[PDB]
Structure 1
């Protein structure tokens, strides 16, 4: 399989329920593109296409679920293989009501690859609870991934302002004006996140 066909190959393996084949195709991508590269060039395009195919009525919700669950497992595997250094953690989650978690996982992964102790909480964390954990662990930052815009629109002005000494917001659902309204620093690029600390 040529690299430019890995995405279709992987989606086709998943849609036939061939998890073993899908795992082999993902590892090929990992070896060809490298860790960050396989996420950019294989995991993300496949998930985007799964969303588009669902939207057009070509696949159902259970096919997306199968694929997303598989790809989340592949990223979790990579995350655990990255280093987890000592020192004040960075808490990584999604806003209340945001159930798309893979962006947050990606952010945690990019941070850990640069030696940052990113604690991935899972998605959908109430802000008082997030603030309390950050305070208790002496967390240097909180990072939020917003895939949809609506969970941010549901938050009052300044809702993110005091969660931790630094609060970063990114993802397709976020922009600079909404970050400003909510009292977070907007970050477009996962690359720029490690630098900013």
Structure 2
């Protein structure tokens, strides 16, 4: 309303002033909060609209790192502090996953020997794996995202049968990795990659997988 008065003082007409203020889009720095606030009140439309802005503004990889991830992290912290309930997190996570799934389907899927992407048994956090899949696809790697929580014998069978060149695992929790016997990941695929918040160099060496710090290097390692 202060801005509107400012525009009126500049010689603008009230009709023009009101229309301009309403037609005003949300500042990029505010996209994170806006997207979070939109989800918490069940405004899926506004949320989808806001994510789309960030996509155009930051780009595909950019909006994940600058919007999708920060919102999820804040959702996690708010829950741990007890500031939001589980249903709220569910709402945001399910949504943000749908967006990531769209981006994934829009990326190319090259032919040739696939790279199986998933999370270790007991890991139900799947978005980190989708990030891995998406970055690989964006770089021309036929990343086949299976979904999360795949038994090692079943994972090994698929990689053999499809002749997969590699397997990539995302560990958000460290407990499922620690619950695995030594060398559990060794013969999953010709190359085995382990990364994620719950992963580290020492634990990967124990399980017989190659540790990857960031997603950028994951692509270079494969190509």
**Pair in the same fold by TM > 0.5:** yes
Secondary structure in 1 aligned to 2:168?
strand
- Distance, in Å, in 2 between the alignment partners of 1:129 and 1:14 is 36
Q: Which has the larger radius of gyration?
A: 2
SS, match of residue 158 in structure 1:
coil
Residues 1:111 and 2:136 aligned together = yes
Q: What is the rounded CA distance, in whole Å, between the counterparts of 1:129 and 1:57 in structure 2? A: 38
Deviations 1:61-102 (A, max 9, x none): 000000000000000000000000100000000000000000
Q: Deviations over 1:128-176 (max 9, x none)?
A: 0000000000000000000000000000000000100000000000000
1:169 match: secondary structure? strand
Higher relative contact order (CA closer than 8 Å, sequence separation 6+)? 1
Q: Secondary structure, in 3 states, of the residue corresponding to 2:167?
A: strand
Q: Does 1:150 align with 2:175?
A: yes
Structure 1 gap ranges (5+): none
State the TM-score, normalized to the length of structure 1. Answer: 1.00
CA positional deviation for 1:36: 0.2
Provide the C-alpha distance between the structure 1 equivalents of 2:216 and 2:54, rounded to a whole number of angstroms: 20
Cα distance in structure 2, aligned partners of 1:187 and 1:4: 30
Task: Please report how far the alpha carbon of residue 103 of structure 1 lies from its aligned counterpart in structure 2 after TM superposition.
Answer: 0.2
Say which SS state the counterpart of residue 193 (structure 1) adopts.
helix
Shift of 1:2: 1.1
Q: Considering only aligned residues, what root-mean-square deviation do their CA atoms show, in Å? A: 0.3
- The normalised TM-score by structure 2 is 0.88
Aligned residues: 197
